[PDB]
Amino acid sequence: AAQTNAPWGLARISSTSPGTSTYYYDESAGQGSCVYVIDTGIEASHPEFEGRAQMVKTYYYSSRDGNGHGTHCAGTVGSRTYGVAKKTQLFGVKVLDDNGSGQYSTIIAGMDFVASDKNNRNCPKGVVASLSLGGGYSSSVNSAAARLQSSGVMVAVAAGNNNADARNYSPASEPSVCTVGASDRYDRRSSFSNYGSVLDIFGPGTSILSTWIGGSTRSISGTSMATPHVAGLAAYLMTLGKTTAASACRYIADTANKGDLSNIPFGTVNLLAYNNYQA
Incomplete structure (x- = not known):
């Protein structure tokens, strides 16, 4: 399947060269996998999610995305027009307030929630987690991401x-x-x-x-927008059965557009996420 006039990043991860505009992707489109968007929330009522999005946890008075950042990133994972895996399930985890901020303790609690909540979900093709957030170094925030990553x-x-x-x-x-x-x-x-x-x-x-x-x-x-490009691709590749949760990152890096990127400092990988779609 192809999407004409796709956002340039959708067209990018399906192409070896830049400048293109058509997003090529296997029709499976991430169907049967779940991506937990860990952000400011999701407006699941957005027609672009086609009912495949829903809030599953908030850490604030509302689960409503009043910032837009979580809606935007979930849109890059699995929205109909702006998403990498357009048939995937989208679970909103609101660990960021409507100002985009959020405590470390809250972000750790969200990752522990996702690691448990997935056992109540139906994701036969696997579970991805997209974390469009940043903060200073923390051994404890790292441990949470490591735990979640190791929980499957x-x-x-x-x-x-x-x-x-x-x-x-x-x-x-x-x-x-x-x-x-x-x-x-x-x-x-x-x-x-x-x-x-x-x-x-x-x-x-x-x-x-x-x-x-x-x-x-x-x-x-x-980089918070680059993350849902990869999380969606992981869901897309996992649904196709080309990888699993524990290896999707390595598989994506081995299948990546190698060396195509300008201004990569010495010692940083020069890999661009790429689905390697042939029809």
């Missing part, structure tokens, strides 16, 4: 938007999860993209058009 959930985290080495950021620096840097439409490392050896992959992260609250859309930038 493919964990994708953002490298962070600091233009620095990602080793000083959690859960970005947890060695066992998938740390995602950001790229732009001309195959450059995004100006803000954290880097370093702990990075496993780069995804489209600059000017990413996806769903937004109120039933709208808006294009924003950040």
Whole structure:
């Protein structure tokens, strides 16, 4: 299947060269897998989610996404027009307030919730977790991401938007999860993209058009937008049975567009997430 006039990042991860506009993807489209979006929430009422999105946990007076960031990222995972795996299930975990912020204790509690809640869900093709969030280094936030990743959930985290080495950021620096840097439409490392050896992959992260609250859309930038590109791809690849939770990050990095990226500092992998779709 193909999506014409797709957002450039959808077209990117299905192409070996930049500049293209059509998103090529196997028709399975991540059907049968679940991605837990760990963010400000999701407006599951957005027609773009087609009923395949729902809130499962909030840590605030409401589960309503009043920030838009979680709706946007869940849109990149599995929305109809702006998503990598367009038939996947979308579970909202609201550990960020409507200002985008959130305590470490809350973010750890959300990861522990997802690791348990998945045992109450129907995800025969596996469980992915998209973590569009950042913070300073924390051994405890890292332990939560590691736990969740080891409980059987493919964990994708953002490298962070600091233009620095990602080793000083959690859960970005947890060695066992998938740390995602950001790229732009001309195959450059995004100006803000954290880097370093702990990075496993780069995804489209600059000017990413996806769903937004109120039933709208808006294009924003950040390694937080590169993460749902990878989480969705992991769900897509897992549904196709090409990988599993424990190995999706490594499989995505081995199947990646190698070396295509400009301005990659020495010692950071030069891999662009790629679904390698042939029809």
